[PDB]
């Protein structure tokens with residue numbers, strides 16, 4: 129028992145982190161097989177960053193200008209190419225620590241672990257959600273670009289995020305491993321609107337199920353609701369509308385606890401309308417939306 | 433910017449996890465050099481656990497009864513001994529992945545990362561505090577015993593905790609790596625009083641400094657207080673009394689922000705007396721005490 133905001137074990141990802149330097153800029157790279165992936169803005173200088181012409185900036189660079197260091201061993205760069213907002217530096221040595229991996233583009237509302245790095249060295253790991261507006265609320269300082277987000281399924285690491293930017297609001301933006309930004313963002317130092325965000329309803333419900341499983345059950349009530357009625361409340365409180373696909377994914381938790389999904393929705397409706405009244409759920413004084421239903425099932429069953 | 437409950441990268445610890453089976457019980461072991469450390473209760477059966485006679489139960493066991501498996505390779509046990517509540521199984525092979533390490537006994541109020549494991553396989557990593565009453569509020573299911581807590585200082589892993597028990601209240605208890613319990617706990621299936629707990633004042637103050645550094649500053653006020661006055665409020669609200677040693681450890685954060693420690697204490701006093709008024713600090717609707725002043729400095733400076 130107990131329920132914590134748990135990150136995946138980061139070892140397989142730690143073995144892939146490298147430092148990439150181009151000119152005056154240093155950031156992190158991900159070394160998988162004989163390729164090192166990193167944000168393309170490693171090629172920018174201070175004067176470039178308002179609106180860099182990446183194609184022109186890259187044309188001034190040769191393989192020998194990309195300094196790649198894996199711990200303390202230097203990698204030989206034998207090719208370079210830009211794909212969307214990432215650079216792919218071909219190296220002459222395959223990473224001996226390359227885990228089984230995939231590149232995946234996650235959906236908004238899904239969760240993943242971030243291994244924050246500086247100078248190719250891991251600093252820490254934390255779990256977060258991709259917001260419905262495609263931003264993440266992480267912990268990133270200058271030099272953390274190139275740090276990656278991932279999930280692990282047995283021995284396979286699915287890389288889903290590479291960090292590129294901190295918006296002027298302090299929230300974070302980045303790309304999948306093919307260099308496509310999540311959201312409307314571009315890799316320039318400009319104020320950029322992040323869409324209206326919402327709370328991830330299916331995750332809050334999954335977390336209320338994790339709370340009942342672990343003994344926090346004060347919020348259960350004698351009520352029920354419908355998807356229609358619940359969605360009027362979700363609308364008022366800026367929660368994602370709940371669909372039958374969300375109800376379906378909550379099936380295992382509903383089956384385990386015996387609490388029908390719409391009955392849990394009625395508990396969530398009452399919490400939205402009345403607040404916590406100075407109480408906590410799983411050590412939180414707010415409704416937590418950074419656990420998916422899969423995360424709850426995995427944590428509650430001790431999956432490795 | 434951004435501030436997250438970050439765990440240390442777990443790779444160095446993942447390389448030390450093994451599975452230990454004795455009879456019908458399987459749990460985790462920590463393989464460092466040629467020794468595997470695990471909870472002594474791996475030698476118990478269901479009928480033993482109310483009050484096991486560990487010395488007698490261990491006398492029935494030989495080296496060949498301790499099955500130690502590191503991933504998929506079997507380790508040969510050439511010695512066994514019980515030290516307090518841990519078993520030390522001498523193996524014929526030194527762990528090639530043994531990091532630089534220390535065994536440390538942490539103080540209540542200090543934080544550490546836990547690598548939750550089942551069957552010698554890592555499941556996840558999370559950061560937590562050792563409560564002032566020597567319990568931890570973790571995420572542990574049956575089979576997680578032997579999972580360890582640790583801190584990392586550059587290349588050195590300081591192991592501080594090994595998981596042994598879930599109290600009937602759902603909170604967790606364990607030992608240092610010499611097998612001495614933190615707190616009054618014994619490794620028996622009995623109801624055991626955990627002392628009155630308190631909130632870790634110096635950590636809440638450190639976290640308010642992390643909040644100001646990251647832009648959440650609505651809680652700053654025009655007031656100041658004294659240690660005496662603050663401690664009367666700390667008393668009322670079950671917070672640890674603040675000492676000059678705590679004020680001293682907050683020095684770097686006070687110097688960086690320019691907010692005197694007693695002025696931050698006056699903000700904390702007002703938050704204790706008035707609550708958050710439906711607002712949040714660093715995404716939390718309660719006063720967070722799981723970040724030490726060292727954690728805040730490390731996270732805010734990007735230490736690797």
Ligand SMILES: Cc1ccncc1NC(=O)[C@H]1[C@@H]2CCCC[C@@H]21
Pocket residue numbers: 169177268269270271272273292293294295315316317433
């Ligand atoms: C400095 C920093 C801090 C944290 N996370 C990320 C960053 N980096 C950025 O925001 C870079 C974005 C793309 C290229 C142009 C310059 C700025």
Ligand SMILES: Cc1ccncc1NC(=O)[C@H]1[C@@H]2CCCC[C@@H]21
Pocket residue numbers: 129473481572573574575576577596597598599619620621
């Ligand atoms: C079952 C479990 C679940 C989570 N964390 C820990 C445990 N294990 C225990 O509580 C064991 C304590 C010491 C020896 C006697 C039996 C019980």
